C-alpha cells in the first residue's frame, strides 16, 4: 500500500491506542447489525436472529478480536499486505467461502469504530490513512480468490 511517512506514524500511533478485544468485538458486532446478511457466516456461533443476540454472543465478540488482531498484523507489513494475507486469502476463499465484498464492508465499519472511540483525534487526514489501509487489507484478502 502507498502511504506517506507522516501517514504511517498516524496509522501506528492510533493503533497503539486500540483495544482489539473491545473494538474487535464492536467492529464485527456492528457489521452483523448494520449489514444483517453478513451474519450468514457465523450462524453456527449461536442465536444471531436479532441485533441484541448478536451483541451478546461470546463467539462473535471473540472472533472480532481475532479479526482485529490479524488486521494489526497487516499494519506491521504495510509494504506487503499481499504476502502477509496470502494464506488467509486462500483460507477465506477455499475453506470459508467468504465473499470478499465483506472485507470492504468490515473496513468501512472499522473506520466508523475508530472515529467513535477517538473523536477529534481521528481527523479527516487520519481517516484518509486508514481508508487506504482498510482497502489495502481488503484487496490483499481478496487477492488469492479464484
Partner 1 sequence: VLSDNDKTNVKATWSKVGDHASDYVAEALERMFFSFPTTKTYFPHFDLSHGSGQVKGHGKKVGEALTQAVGHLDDLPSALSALSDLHAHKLRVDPVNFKLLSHCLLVTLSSHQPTEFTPEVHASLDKFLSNVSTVLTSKYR
Please state the residue numbers annotated as binding site for heme b: 44, 66, 92
Site size toward partner 1 (CB under 8 A) is 42
The interface partner of residue 53, options being ligand HEM, partner 1, none and the CB cut-off 5 to 8 Å by kind, is: none
CB-facing half-sphere around the CA of 8: CA atoms within 13 A: 11
H or E segment to which residue 66 belongs: helix 58-74
Quick check: 98 binds ligand HEM (CB under 6 A)?
Answer: yes
Contact by Cβ (8 Å): 53, 46: yes
Would you state the cell numbers that stand for residue 79, as one nine-digit string? 509494504
Task: Tell me the per-residue interface mask from 39 to 68 with ligand HEM, x by CB under 6 A, - otherwise.
Answer: --xx--------------------x--xx-
Report d(CA 85, CA 65) in Å as an integer: 17
d(CA 59, CA 129): 30
In the complex, least distance from residue 114 CB atom to partner 1, rounded to whole angstroms:
9
d(CA 121, CA 105): 23
Report the residue number, 10 or 74, with the smaller CB distance to ligand HEM.
Answer: 74
Binding to ligand HEM (CB under 6 A) within 68-97 occurs at 70-71, 74, 85, 88, 91-92, 96
Asked if 41 and 95 touch (Cβ cutoff 8 Å), the reply is no
Under the rule (CB under 6 A), what is the footprint of ligand HEM? Answer: 38, 41-42, 63, 66-67, 70-71, 74, 85, 88, 91-92, 96, 98, 102-103, 105-106, 137, 141
Amino acid at each position: 500500500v502507498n502511504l506517506t511517512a507522516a501517514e504511517k506514524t498516524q496509522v501506528a500511533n492510533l493503533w497503539g491506542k486500540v483495544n482489539v478485544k473491545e473494538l474487535g468485538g464492536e467492529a464485527l458486532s456492528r457489521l452483523l447489525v448494520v449489514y444483517p446478511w453478513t451474519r450468514r457466516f457465523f450462524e453456527h456461533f449461536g442465536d444471531l436472529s436479532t441485533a441484541d443476540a448478536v451483541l451478546h454472543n461470546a463467539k462473535v465478540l471473540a472472533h472480532g478480536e481475532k479479526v482485529l488482531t490479524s488486521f494489526g498484523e497487516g499494519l506491521k507489513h504495510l509494504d506487503n499486505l499481499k504476502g502477509t494475507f496470502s494464506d488467509l486469502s486462500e483460507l477465506h476463499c477455499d475453506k470459508l467461502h467468504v465473499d470478499p465484498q465483506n472485507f470492504r464492508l468490515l473496513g468501512n465499519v472499522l473506520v466508523i469504530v475508530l472515529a467513535r472511540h477517538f473523536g477529534k483525534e481521528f481527523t479527516p487526514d487520519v481517516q484518509a490513512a486508514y481508508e487506504k489501509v482498510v482497502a489495502g487489507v481488503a484487496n490483499a484478502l481478496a487477492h488469492k480468490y479464484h
